[PDB]
Structures are given as C-alpha cells and as structure tokens.
Design a protein around this nucleic acid. Structure first.
Ligand SMILES: [Mg+2]
Lengths: 143, 122, 258, 164
RNA sequence: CAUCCGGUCGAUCCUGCCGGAGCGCGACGCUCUCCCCAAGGACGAAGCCAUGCAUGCCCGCUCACCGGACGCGGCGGACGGCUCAGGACAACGGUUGCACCCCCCGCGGCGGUCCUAGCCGGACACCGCUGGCAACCCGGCGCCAAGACGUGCGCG
RNA sequence: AUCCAAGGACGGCAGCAGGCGCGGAACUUGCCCAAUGCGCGGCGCGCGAGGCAGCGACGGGGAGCGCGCGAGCGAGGCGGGCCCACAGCCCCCGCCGCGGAGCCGAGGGCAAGCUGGUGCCAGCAGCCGCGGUAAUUCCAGCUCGGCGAGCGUCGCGCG
C-alpha cells in the first residue's frame, strides 16, 4: 500500500521512523539540544541569582495593569533574566541587591498569562519563602 | 498464682561439646515468672541447677506464651571451655574486668610502630 | 581485571543448591581447592552447622574439626572449608554415625546412612587416561586422584571401586547399554535409570538416552552420567529410588505433611 | 554494602484515574459509613487485592481445562479463597471468582465477624473495643481492626480472658 | 485495570494545536500523635584537602631483662573497600577453542642423579663502646643463631 | 602543597568520619569484632570489611485524636524483667495517668455560596477569562468541599 509491508523490510521502516520523528516540535525541543544550551537554568528545577533592578511591566491589550517584576543575574551563568513576584504587596519585601531563588511558571518555557516575555517566578528571598512572608508565618527582620 | 508449666522440645545430644540442645517453652497465663531463675529447677527436673544457660528468651504479644533456649552441660569445666565469654559474664560464673577503649589501643600500637629498636618505653 | 586469584564469595553469588538464606550475611564460605570443584561440592561447615546442627557458629565448628572429630575417606580433616562431594564417606565415630554423600531427586546433597560392610570403599569415575613420566600409564578420577598401572581393560567413563584403606582397584563396571546409572549434573540431578541409547556427534557432545523404572525417558550429556553397578546399585541409595514427582504430587505430599 | 539494601518493599493500593466523580464519592462514603472505615486507603487496598485475584482468574480461564498449569493454579486459588471465607464453599469453578466483589472482602474483617456474632453493638463500638485489647482470636489477643479471620477461626473468636 | 473534558463562530460540523485530569523520580514551602522497614555529596568540580583510624599474624632461631622484649626468618599484604574520568566493530552479553598457553595454596601420586655425612664454612640483624644532624636519616669497632646464605655425601 | 636551627627533607581521601569550594540538591571527626567472612595460627589476635548505635517527612507499611449517658483504653512519667560485646528500641509485669489536623479550593473544565471593602488601581488567572460601583473569580469574616499525618508548588520521564 502506501507503506511498505514486505516480510524483509524492517530496515526501511526503522529508517523511515528515524527520519520522520524529528518533525514533532516537542520531540525536537527535547532531543535536539539547542533548548538545553539556550535555557538559562540548564535543565534545573530552579536557580539562585542576584536582583539588580526593580521594574513594572504593563499587561496586554485586553487587560490593563502594571505587573511587578525584578531583573536578576544568575550566579552560575552571569546572564540576565526577568522574574516576576506575583503575590500582592510582596515587592516591598524584595530589596535591591538581594539574594533570591527563582523558579519557573507552569508552562515549560513559554510566557504565562498577559505578562509579556516573562517566564520565571520568585519563590525565596533572603532564605525565606515569599508565600510564608505573605501569610506572616515569618518576618524578615534580618534585612 | 497461676502455675507456670514448662516443657522441653528438640532434645539433641552433643557429645562433641558435652552438652544437650534444647528449646524450652513456658506457659504463664496471667502473671509472670522470676528473671529466668525459677525456671532452672523445672528444666533440670524435666531433663545440677548451676550447669544450664538460658539466653534466647522472647515474650509474645499478650504475654501468654514465652519461648526460649537452654544449654545443659555435663561438667563445669566443659561449660568453661565451650562457651562465649559474655554468657559467663552475664551468668554468675566469672568477673568482668573493666574494658578499655580500642581507640587508645590503636593509638598505642601506632605510636609503638613509629619507634625503632627497643620501643617498650612507649 | 583483578590482579590475582579470588578469595572471597558473596552470598548472593553462591550456588543455589546450597540453600543459603539471603539475610544470613553478606558473605558465604569460600571452599578451598581439593578433591572437588566449587560447583560440585559443599563445604564441611555447612553440613556440620546448618544441617546436623551439632554447632551453632563458625568457631564451634573450628574447635570440633581441630579436635579431630570427623573423618573423610579415612583421613581426619581440620579445614572448615574442605569440599565434600558425590560418593564421599562421612563417618563420625564419637556418635557411630556413618553417611555417604549422594544426590536427592530435587538436585541437592543428602546424607544416606550406611553400614560397616560397605564403608571400606567408594566409587570413582575415570575420565582421563594419559602417559606420565617415563611413559608410565596413569589414570585419573572425579575426586582428583591418580592411580599408576591400571588394567588395560579399563577405559574412559568407566566406574572403579577402590578400598578406602588402600587405593587398589577391585572390580570395574563398563559403560554400556543396559547398565544402571545416576545423573549428577544439570536438570536431572538425582535421577536413576538404565541406558537405552548412545549417539555421538563428531567434534561435539555425546548424548545419552536413559529410561526410568516407571517408563519415563530423559536425555543428558555424557559428562554427568555416573555408573553405579550392573543393573542393580552397588551402594545404598536414598529411601526414594530416583523418582522425581510432578508439582501436583509434591503439593499433595506437602498438604498431607501439613 | 549494608544488608538492609536487599530488603524488599512495595505499595498496596491504587488511586482512581478520575477523582471527582459523584457516584463514586457517594458509593465510597456509603461503604465507609456502613463498615466504619477510617480513610479511603482501605477501599483502595481492597480494590487492589480484588484486581489481583481477578487477573489470576482471567489468565487461568484463557487456557484449556486440561492444562497442568491451569489445574495447579486454580486449585491453589480456590483453596485460598475457601479457607479465607471470601468465596462460598459450594462453588468450585474458576468462573465464580470473577463475580466476587469488595463487600465480600469486607464481610470477613474482625469488626464484621464480631458484630454478626452480637458481640458488639456497632462497627464503631467494635473498633473501640478492639483497640483497648478486650478481644482475642484462638486465645491470642488481636488489636488490628483490619485483621481478617479465616473460617476455621470464626467459632474461636471470643472476649479476652484477661480483659476487664 | 481497552474512559476523556474546556478553548477559533452571529450559530453549525471538521482539521489542528493549546490547556486539564494519573503514576514515578528529585528539589522548594506549610505542618506533624505512636510503632515497624528504609535511601542518604552521583547529577558538564575524577576540584582541593588540616586531624584521627583503615594489615597483620606466627610455627623456626633465646647466654636479652627475669621464659615476655627486640630482631632474623616464614605467610599475607595482587583479596576486600571507593568511583565511573577515559574508551563507541572496543568494553559487555550469550556461544566455541588452545592439536598456540601460564598458574600459588590445597588434594592425590611419584620419589633411582655421571665425573667431615655421629653433622661443613663465613657472615649480618638485635645488642655493647664510641659518634655525626634542626629534622628525616644513618656511620665505625666488636663476641653470637638458624627450617637464613654458600658448598655439598648420591643407583644418569 | 608542607617543615627548615635555610645547608636540606617531605606528600597524594574517587577507603571511614570530618573541613573548604560548587551547587537547587545530600548525615556522627561515635562503640565493637559478639554475629557473616578473610589473613595468620591449635584452645587465639586483627580487620572504619562488616555489625551496633546517632541525624534522617527520599520513601514504603500499620494504629489514633473517641464510644456512650458509664465505664474503658491510649500516649507520657517512675520502677522490675527480656534483649544487647556494653547500652538503648520492641515486648511483658507493677504505681501515677497531657486526647493535639493541617494543606489546598468554592465561575467552567472539576466536588464544593453571605456580608464588608477597593474600583481595569491593587490583584487573580496552567486555558477560557475576572476587576471601569452586587466583583458568584481580588483582599477579609461565615459557611462549605477534597485528601489526610500529610498537603501544595517547580523540572524531568511514561500515559
Ligand atoms: Mg655427582
């Protein structure tokens, strides 16, 4: 038929699948290697960096808001990223030139929501979880 | 006082070690026994009260049944040879010198190895 | 690559037919070289400690053996790792116990008690004939023993009876169709039967077809076929006569014993 | 290495693939109230065991009747089920197994057997009594609510002699 | 132990992707009554290492001090333990062979040796006296043992 | 890389503990050969192999914060046994007897709704979307649901 089907045709089928399975975006992104060399976290759950600028970013057209984020530089790479601290009033707990831990959003490496070109989240600052600081479980009187 | 009745199971003669192999079970439904000491008389009856050793005593859930071991020797000399030391120490057969830390012994051995010729000084 | 020979043995790497508990320890005894090899032997301590139960530890077995309380083929052995093999004589005079080491149907070593009349000899399998120094004919066996000046009528794969006191041959059984045999290797260890056929292939193995007393037939290679007489066994054999029951009958027997 | 590395271990239960399902929640709560179960891990355990038995029965049933393996395995499975009281004695065919259900497993629990003997007022009372060690099986005190009683021990379950 | 659901339109059917729903491996965060089992600096740093421990035993040789020291000699230290850098018809897994091979302990045999044998010769170690050097290290003189070394009695 | 009375001498933890650096990420500078074995050896020595203990929510398994109109049992403490190379631990026996639930969510997918604030700001939201004066979606209180001594978030693999 369209596909070869003879009893001595295993080699051709193997080669066909080998060539054709590179056309899937997911399979390429996983098994090609470019993404790993381009991802600032090099396949890690989260990274540690230093905040250097506190900035606010406007939202997209159908929304109207200014989201609070900070600029970070990763210790182990020295490159630059933008990480966004979501919880209300949690910008005031983050201070310039502070040690932070930055993780990802739900999606692997795409932008999430109406925030344009942002792919990282702040979770720990100065060794204390932001979620815990927001609930008043602990206090940052060491800084 | 609930009478305690004890048995003997798995009797094997061991002339090589001059002893008898022995599994002893005790039934004490209700109260308990007295530190394995009242049991020696009963075991001796069933098979010298000072020529037996008990070491593997376990009490099951609820305390109704207790199972253990025994070792009956024909002579005290045989018990002195064929027997690990800690058993003798636990029993009232010998006295236990105060043990010394093996760390000090290793340190002394290394120090002595360091010296040459006659090193009995250290 | 190790730079020399091996002296240890992990417990999980030991032979299955030794029946060693997984949780007993990291290590297992390493048998020393002797009459029998590693995979066709069992150390003395295992027999003396984990079966007969006359000892409960390594040390007790060491004392018992160094006090000369076991004789192997008429010779006292003090090595706890000495290897015991098939058709060996195990005598303990202190308790008047005499055993011959054989195979059970399941494929494990067993101790068959014997009498005084038949404990003065053993059966050996001759598998190599060669010329030694000065062209003198020689002969070797499965227990690592050599005899000079054998009878010309004795060929390879035959079976030889030798007095324990004196290593002198008495009579010999030929390898031929119609002779009772006992299987000592593979899937059929412990089975007893009579030879029905012999087929040879040039440059490869020789296959032997045997029939059991009940009519069952089985095959095995000649490297583990042992002759034990002329139509009737020459030595006392286990209570069962080399019959392997099926799983169903074994389960019935287990339930009966339960 | 340490000998503790060769110790085996495994799980005992399975979670549903779709969690929020109204009829399933209702049935599970109903069963929990009827038998007074603590949490929902017990139901998952029961389902796991039932699945194991059903899979064994399926595999055996796929084969021929006169297959030696079929006879061996079916005989063992039936003997176990009968001894445990899960399957009725008068059934001795592998087909009957596939119709079994978790409620049959539950009915053989210690709470259930002592309740049907009128020895306890309620499943909750049975659990409270079991914890305090006022109950025994064959002269031995059992304090595990989920302990399953074999048929031969059904008449041997009584109150602990030493209990107040 | 063979399951789907929400999102392109004014409404409708499709293709097609985005997202959700489960299991496992790790890290982060909150919290934590009792018992049992149990992993634990592997994750582009095979990077760097104070401190302590990880290989000894003893048959032979006692005119040593009062036989125990010490030393010569013998066995062992090539096993065990750690890690996965390097290496892509290699290593490795199954299946052959050496009529192209080597092998300690152990088991069983075998054991004839050309041209002072009531028992041969000389030394060293430990030790004594005298000394060098910050340390590490050794020097010279001197009596003594061997299952140590050398020579060697003998049916090729 | 180390000591030097400056002429000289000396080292190799990817062995057990411990330390620095690195990193998202990982434990005591503990006791013992009694067990399993190895080396030597006749009534034994040694072994950071190995065993025992300590930290330990990687993780797995079993019980519980009540039943009832009054009784009973836990955890916990003080003592005695058993065990242990020495000690704990489990278990048994006596006298007193600390009953403590969190993490997520309530528009749909997806089981689960009442006042007060703010006013496209602050914020939520994996996706669709909410918020420009009732906000069923933000921040709070009440109530409710799921799993449960565990719950949630991030990355990877299978589905
Ligand atoms: Mg000559």
């Amino acid at each position: 038929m369209s596909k070869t089907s003879g009893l001595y045709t295993a080699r051709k089928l193997r080669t066909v699948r080998r060539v054709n399975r590179w056309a899937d975006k997911k399979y390429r992104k996983a098994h090609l290697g470019t993404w790993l060399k381009a991802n600032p976290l090099e396949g890690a759950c989260m990274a540690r960096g230093i905040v250097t600028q506190k900035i606010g970013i406007s939202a997209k057209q159908p929304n109207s808001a200014v989201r609070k984020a900070v600029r970070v530089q990763l210790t182990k790479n020295s490159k630059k990223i933008t990480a966004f601290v979501p919880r209300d009033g949690s910008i005031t707990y983050i201070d310039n030139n502070d040690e932070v831990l930055v993780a990802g959003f739900g999606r692997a490496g795409r932008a999430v929501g109406d925030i344009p070109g942002c792919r990282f989240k702040v979770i720990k600052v100065a060794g204390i979880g932001l979620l815990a600081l927001f609930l008043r479980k602990r206090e940052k009187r060491a800084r | 006082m609930p009478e305690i009745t004890v048995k003997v199971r798995k009797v094997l003669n061991n002339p090589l070690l001059q002893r008898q192999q022995c599994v002893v079970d005790v039934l004490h439904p209700g109260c308990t026994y007295e530190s394995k000491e009242a049991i020696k008389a009963k075991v001796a009856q069933q098979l010298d009260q000072k020529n037996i050793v008990l070491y593997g005593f376990k009490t099951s859930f609820g305390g109704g049944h207790t199972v253990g071991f025994c070792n009956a020797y024909q002579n005290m000399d045989a018990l002195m040879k064929y027997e690990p030391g800690f058993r003798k120490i636990r029993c009232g057969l010998i006295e236990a010198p105060k043990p010394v830390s093996r760390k000090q012994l290793k340190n002394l051995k290394n120090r002595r190895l360091k010296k040459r010729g006659t090193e009995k000084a250290t | 690559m190790a730079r020399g020979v091996r002296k240890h043995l992990k417990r999980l790497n030991a032979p299955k037919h030794w029946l060693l508990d997984k949780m007993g320890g990291i290590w297992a005894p390493r048998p020393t070289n002797g009459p029998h090899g590693l995979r066709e032997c069992i150390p003395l301590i295992l027999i003396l400690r984990n079966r007969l139960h006359y000892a409960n530890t390594y040390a007790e077995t060491s004392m018992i053996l160094q006090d000369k309380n076991v004789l192997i083929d008429g010779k006292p052995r003090t090595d706890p790792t000495f290897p015991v093999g098939f058709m060996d004589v195990f005598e303990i005079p202190k308790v008047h116990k005499t055993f011959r080491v054989l195979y059970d149907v399941k494929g494990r070593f067993t101790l068959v008690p014997i009498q005084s009349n038949e404990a003065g000899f053993k059966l050996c399998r001759v598998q190599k004939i060669f010329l030694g120094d000065k062209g003198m004919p020689y002969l070797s066996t499965h227990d690592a023993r050599t005899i000079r000046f054998p009878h010309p009528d004795i060929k390879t794969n035959d079976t030889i009876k030798i007095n324990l006191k004196t290593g002198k041959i008495d009579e010999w059984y030929k390898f031929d169709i119609g002779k009772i045999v006992m299987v000592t290797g593979g899937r059929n260890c412990g089975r007893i039967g009579t030879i029905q056929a012999i087929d040879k292939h040039m440059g490869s193995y020789t296959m032997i077809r045997m029939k059991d007393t009940e009519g069952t037939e089985f095959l095995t290679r000649l490297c583990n076929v042992f002759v034990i007489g002329n139509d009737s066994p020459a030595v006392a054999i286990p209570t069962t006569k080399g019959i392997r029951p099926d799983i169903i009958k074994n389960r019935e027997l287990r339930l009966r014993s339960i | 290495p340490r000998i503790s590395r060769h110790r085996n271990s495994s799980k005992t239960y399975s979670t549903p693939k779709k969690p929020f399902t109204k009829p399933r929640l209702d049935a599970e709560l109903k069963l929990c109230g009827e038998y007074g179960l603590k949490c929902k891990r017990e139901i998952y355990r029961a389902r796991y065991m039932l699945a194991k038995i059903r899979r064994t029965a399926r595999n055996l049933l796929t084969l021929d009747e006169n297959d030696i393996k079929r006879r061996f395995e079916g005989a063992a499975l039936l003997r176990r089920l009968h001894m445990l009281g899960i399957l009725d004695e008068e059934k001795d065919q592998l087909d009957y197994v596939l119709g079994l259900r978790i409620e049959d497993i539950f009915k053989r629990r210690l709470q259930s057997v002592i309740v049907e003997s009128k020895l306890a007022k309620s499943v909750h009372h049975a659990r409270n009594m079991i914890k305090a060690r006022h109950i025994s099986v064959g002269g031995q005190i059992v304090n595990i609510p989920s302990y399953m009683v074999r048929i031969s021990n059904t008449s041997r379950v009584a109150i602990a002699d030493t209990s107040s």
